[model samples]
Target: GGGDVGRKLIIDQNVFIEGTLPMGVVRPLTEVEMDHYREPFLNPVDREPLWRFPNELPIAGEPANIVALVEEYMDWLHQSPVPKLLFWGTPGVLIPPAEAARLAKSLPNCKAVDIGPGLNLLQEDNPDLIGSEIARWLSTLEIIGTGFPFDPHYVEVLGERMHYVDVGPRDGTPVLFLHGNPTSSYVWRNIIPHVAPTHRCIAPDLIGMGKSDKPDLGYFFDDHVRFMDAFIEALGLEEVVLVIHDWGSALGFHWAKRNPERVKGIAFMEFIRPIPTWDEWPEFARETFQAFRT
Candidate 1:
């Protein structure tokens, strides 16, 4: 029955727990939840073939390539100045409790929470539990002093209106969060509320991303830097603590380097230094580069 249930869940795509397909939720799905889950792909006929995309992934199939990529990625992840990792695990799901425990132990400064019986631990099931657990984790970080509910606001930067979540008192210490590729300030939704009370928490949607102005220009690194510079200058930010993820790390570091006096501290996750000589990278990395370049 578990095998049959897993197969049905896999086909449905309505629930994935710890990367594993899980049995259907006991309750009926809400309209919004159904839309959120189903809207990504409108037609099951078209979605059927999409499954082959990852199955046919070429880069990591080879043992040596997988090993190198894993090692390099892990090494980079461990190098974060802010070493802590907040990992949420789902039991009776894809990762299974034991495997998730092993993964948490393998990384430094990492802690795992088992939220017990859910699909995709954070997204579809047990949102309140995960959110509160995350809030508790944030509270333990003394750097974050307060928290509050907020509505997104906008600021004009270089003629572009940048959307941002601004919360807490204006005079409080400033903590700016920067997001990564294919993501906007929305990614920080859960984190911002945890620290908004004592700190002036600000999360901006980068130019051409999120609700920000999307002009016709190519989205280049320098373009992002220019927008960031204008945004910070317009806001008159000082002594900021930068929180970054993925591309945010690259942009945040450069911004701080260029304006060292304005930045008091930095925290980051999942970032890599620029590899100028692309061909010199490991096979899997090179393949990833090639896959995207075209």
Candidate 2:
């Protein structure tokens, strides 16, 4: 939130998102992630209720917390019998599991899942789980499912459009950016600028994530590696500085291992060492890290 300067005290959505977007867990959020949420709320005046829900609906100035509003909605929900699913989180959730259960008893078509102390924001706390659950719920309904545009670089990666950001000098050995899960090349936006002036920086949104095409692949670890290989080879990045993290570290190390002479340098963090062994990994995280969809 912004401190009141000289005008009407404006709530800075930028800082707001940075603090609230993630549970501040697993790892710190990059600037890009913060901006990702801030993009929609950037303009205060242009926020029309066409796409978003209008608070003016039913009554203009009545407080939303009023039982009258709740009663109205509950009655309408019962009558509508809309196919819907509710995600319940604990401790500080807006609608507690008990309340959600209460809602469920009345609305026969509704289903519910608990996200485990996700607090007020489910998406920020556990995006991967929340997203998958939503996808699964939508699948039951058979609902088949943005940008402050990146001006992306498109390449054909094994018959799918792979989106990437290619910046800086074209002649130099490129810095290939491979990111972690539940996020995309957007994570590298801040870091890429620093290196871009001296070398070519290529940050790719992996095949099924970000702005890239979501082809029906099994999304195994091998699938990611394959797509990454095709992307690198397609762009003819024979010489690259491997900048990576998480699963990207795996892909980066794989390439570096095969093409040692071509890679000038390798930089990594949150890496999986020991050539794909769980021996060096923390005992607690081994199971989570070694997840294979197949």
Candidate 3:
């Protein structure tokens, strides 16, 4: 739940749909399968993490601990006065869409955009398929269901042009960015140039999102990793400083992880820490992770 879902999807008074947003059912991808897809992005050949606790594994506390993290995210949305967040995810069992919509409408400065895959419950029940086409379609429905205009942009990596958003200073340090799922690098618009004068920030639209090309070509995580591996070599960024968040974190950390000797100190920006075990998560978290662990 990134933005306020309620207010974002609420049809004032009477916005009725003739039918459900073209619901297309699809099977889920297994965690192993997802890892396989991600292999291209997280290439074993070039996977490097900027920051590493070589001596210690990632922290995955009890259910309360993980829920605290989720709560912290929600609190950011509710109480972050600096930039006023539009969405937050609580540690509730499962928030129904209607309830979520209501919550969004109640917010003062938030938009209540319903984001995230399906409910944690649904995800637990069906981890393999939560991120499937059906999920994307549901999310797509949320988009067209709101009836918003489209905006687009593009950039070039090697010889291939892709979509992107320029946020940091053109004269600042060049920091190419990559984003996580269900969200593009747009999330950094409010924060990119925070150090732009000292750091030139550039974020890509990934292959299938933002203003970039969304061809139906089958691509996996390793493919993405190979691209970046070549990119770093091409740019000759031996001492590049990386600041990662979510999926971008893996991009930066993975690159640095493999080449620890060359990576500068990394700044973890709300990134996901790769854990070594699955016995520590809560029942709910375990559900969301069933397919994710594969």
Candidate 4:
């Protein structure tokens, strides 16, 4: 379950251009600094073997090699800034994320890199594979020109100042809408306006997601469940209506099972319910299920 480390910051995005903004001052102290800050947000789960293009794995080079490549790219970015980049997913000692992080650290303007879930890497371990969600996060950096949103903020939740977001009405009933892997709070932006007039919609950019935080904190089913319990309790949400999709179903059901009294009637849209009898579905529906199962 994701607990909020309550700490907040108000910054003028303008000062960011001059690197005069004291943005990182509020960032959660890394694990080396504190324990509560180290509470698990994304659950570390066992990896499943979900292949995208079969027989296309066994790439070499580990995190160390990846860091080297990032240095090279950083060198390029420092020397010459490019609007867009075109590169093959060429695996080798060349494009590792740690290297990118190294490069990012060097660039005073370069801010943060958000790693997201729902990529083949979660299902299939490939060091070079930049998950689709990770790509979009990088894109946001281009849009805003800074990872300010993800730049660790000292948000105080339950007396702990850690990196977190204030996404909904302060007084509205917390209706946490968790997005599935690969998607973030953006999924609810459109849907939120429609409902915001009445209920407070609190959507978390889950660990390894959105501008919230992307800890390599491997996400798993049970860990997600724990995140919800801790997060809700930390926030003191006396009443909560969990609205979710995709893997969100697991959290919702888990919450319901754990704290049935707190959950009101859950309105589910197209979702994955853990039905026991697969035989209930028609043969065609079962065979076509590969669309989601994959």
**Number of the predicted model whose TM-score against the real structure is largest:** 1
Ranked candidates (TM-score, high to low): 1, 2, 3, 4
lDDT to native, each model: 0.52, 0.51, 0.38, 0.36
Worst 10 residues of 2 by lDDT: 49-58
Instruction: Quote the lDDT for 38 in model 1.
Output: 42
Q: What tens digits encode model 1's per-residue C-alpha lDDT throughout 110-181?
A: 566655554222322443454455445555554411122458699998888998888877875587888754
Q: In model 1, which regions exceed 4 Å deviation?
A: 1-149, 275-289
Please give, for residues 61-133, the per-residue lDDT of candidate 2 as tens digits.
2323322433443454455434545555654223445665676677647666665654434434454554455
Q: Pairs clashing in candidate 1?
A: 16-120, 20-94, 146-195, 146-197, 146-198, 147-196, 147-197
Local lDDT at 77 for model 4: 39
Error of 1 at 75 (Å): 16
lDDT of 3 by residue, 1-294 (tens): 521232122122110111011110023433443332233223221212101111112334423443343334344333422111122123212233454455456533433332344422222222233223222222222110111122344545556556554443444235555554423454344344344444555566555434444444333444455655755565445554454445455456567646655543343333444343455433544433332222
* Per-residue error (Å), model 4, residue 276: 6.4
- 2 against 3, candidate with superior TM-score: 2
TM-score of candidate 2 against the unseen true structure: 0.49
TM-score of each: 0.53, 0.49, 0.43, 0.41
Candidate RMSDs in Å, in order, are 10.7, 20.8, 16.3, 20.8
lDDT, candidate 4, 178-294, per-residue tens: 655334454444444444444555666554444443333334443445555666666667866555554554456456655655654343222232223335333433432222222
**Ten residues in sequence with the least summed lDDT for candidate 1:** 48-57
